[PDB]
Design an enzyme around this catalytic site. Structure first.
Site, PDB file in Angstrom:
ATOM      1  N   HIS A  41       0.793  -1.228   0.000  1.00 35.44           N
ATOM      2  CA  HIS A  41       0.000   0.000   0.000  1.00 35.44           C
ATOM      3  C   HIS A  41       0.835   1.293   0.000  1.00 35.44           C
ATOM      4  O   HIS A  41       0.286   2.386  -0.083  1.00 35.44           O
ATOM      5  CB  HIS A  41      -0.982   0.015   1.170  1.00 35.44           C
ATOM      6  CG  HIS A  41      -0.365   0.372   2.485  1.00 35.44           C
ATOM      7  ND1 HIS A  41       0.009  -0.573   3.416  1.00 35.44           N
ATOM      8  CD2 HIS A  41      -0.060   1.574   3.028  1.00 35.44           C
ATOM      9  CE1 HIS A  41       0.515   0.031   4.473  1.00 35.44           C
ATOM     10  NE2 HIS A  41       0.485   1.337   4.264  1.00 35.44           N
ATOM     11  N   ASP A  86       0.082  -7.664   2.111  1.00 35.35           N
ATOM     12  CA  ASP A  86       0.478  -6.266   1.887  1.00 35.35           C
ATOM     13  C   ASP A  86       1.992  -6.191   1.817  1.00 35.35           C
ATOM     14  O   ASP A  86       2.636  -5.622   2.698  1.00 35.35           O
ATOM     15  CB  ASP A  86      -0.012  -5.368   3.037  1.00 35.35           C
ATOM     16  CG  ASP A  86       0.074  -3.863   2.713  1.00 35.35           C
ATOM     17  OD1 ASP A  86      -0.242  -3.054   3.604  1.00 35.35           O
ATOM     18  OD2 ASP A  86       0.441  -3.478   1.587  1.00 35.35           O
ATOM     19  N   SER A 184       4.750   2.430   7.891  1.00 33.41           N
ATOM     20  CA  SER A 184       4.295   1.310   7.059  1.00 33.41           C
ATOM     21  C   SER A 184       5.436   0.722   6.248  1.00 33.41           C
ATOM     22  O   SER A 184       6.252   1.446   5.682  1.00 33.41           O
ATOM     23  CB  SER A 184       3.176   1.729   6.101  1.00 33.41           C
ATOM     24  OG  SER A 184       2.033   2.192   6.805  1.00 33.41           O
TER      25      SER A 184
END
EC number: 3.4.21.78
Lengths: 234, 234
Positions: A41, A86, A184
């Site tokens: 992402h 992810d 992230s």
């Protein structure tokens, strides 16, 4: 990173700073001279940058190595809806110069799950508690994986979303210890071994007890794909 | 099928009998003249037969249309470890003869998630109670959707396997009514609508309250793969 501390400059030589644009950054891990593992992402563009050997975003450091992405390899089974799988692999246009401040983080020899209570660490340039913007200097916090059954109970994600067997929960039942926006893709290390990729938590509720951090487990499946991709290309 | 009854011969014209070999069979649904939707874990071999308009496996029937698979289309992101995305489209060498005893089951309009308590049914030539041998005639059982949260509680699968948002549970809390070995690939019908595909239960324990039937939910991601696959020719 929330509830952590500023690490010693370059004491985590495997950390990758991903400067996506002027409004967002992500983290990653150098798993090979010309390969960076991050979150799927984390969107990259022409304004993005892959910085190695860094500590401060701004500060001009001679150790930094700004690399280019030759090609992006997102996990073909990535499900942007739940953030499952992810993971995304970044092939660099040139091999990184391995030294004392820029090093490789080796993949898990086995893709077994992480037992609840295990201690793990997470580094990153994301936002902290007393701040809204990202942290200029690298930071790391110590956390503990929460039993995925608890990760799914009413006191937590409560099946919204569901944490599958290819994901791990980690943080603190009390909260305060966690990774935030900007972290992230940061590599999740448990007991000194790469075990997951920072994926997500509760929006704007970083450190909140109900939203413990969620990391993509480097399971056998994910591992086999990663290895297949490194050797599959040229 | 366990806890059900023998349906009226050809009263479920959309049912597909998949004779894999001499030791195993599966079920499926005719979603198009030349397309059968079944489970990915249902293995087919050179001498496998896709039988249409069937009721009895042994007995000879003039309504039967023995077909052959021209090419298998398993779900690209199907995970055999957790039976995640357990789906497979079978392209037939020749299209079927749509008649009163051979119909096409419609795909869901919206990839919704069936609400707990909804009434559903499942047909198959799988095994029955006390009768370990695969039923010779087609059978169906009236089942109810079990809340996913409950499907993962300690008194059930207890997060292992974990039942995700792309899987539904149906059957009975008291048990006794459930799909069984051989019924894999069989379509789950709720309120008269195709809502899922039979995937698994508990090894040699179908009907056990502790392990209600798990069906791949025909969600948007899944439906798209289906609709996107058919159109594709090369």
């Amino acid at each position: 990173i929330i509830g952590g501390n500023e690490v010693t400059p370059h004491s985590r030589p495997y950390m990758v700073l991903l400067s996506l644009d002027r409004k967002t950054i992500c983290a990653g891990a150098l798993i090979a001279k010309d390969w960076v593992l991050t979150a799927a992402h984390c969107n990259l563009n022409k304004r993005s940058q892959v910085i190695l050997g860094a500590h401060s975003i701004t500060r001009e450091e001679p150790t930094k190595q700004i690399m280019l992405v030759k090609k992006e390899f997102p996990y073909p089974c990535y499900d942007p809806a739940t953030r499952e799988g992810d993971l995304k692999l970044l092939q660099l246009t040139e091999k990184a110069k391995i030294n004392k401040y820029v090093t490789i983080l080796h993949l898990p020899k086995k893709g077994d799950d992480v037992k609840p209570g295990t201690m793990c660490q997470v580094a990153g340039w994301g936002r902290t508690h007393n701040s809204a913007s990202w942290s200029d200097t690298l930071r790391e916090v110590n956390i503990t994986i929460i039993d995925r059954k608890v990760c799914n109970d009413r006191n937590h994600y409560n099946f919204n979303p569901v944490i599958g067997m290819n994901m791990v929960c980690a943080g603190s039942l009390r909260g305060g210890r966690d990774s935030c926006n900007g972290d992230s893709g940061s590599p999740l290390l448990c007991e000194g071994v790469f075990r997951g990729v920072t994926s997500f938590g509760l929006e704007n509720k970083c450190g909140d007890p109900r939203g413990p951090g969620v990391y993509i487990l480097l399971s056998k499946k994910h591992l086999n794909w990663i290895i297949m991709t490194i050797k599959g290309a040229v």
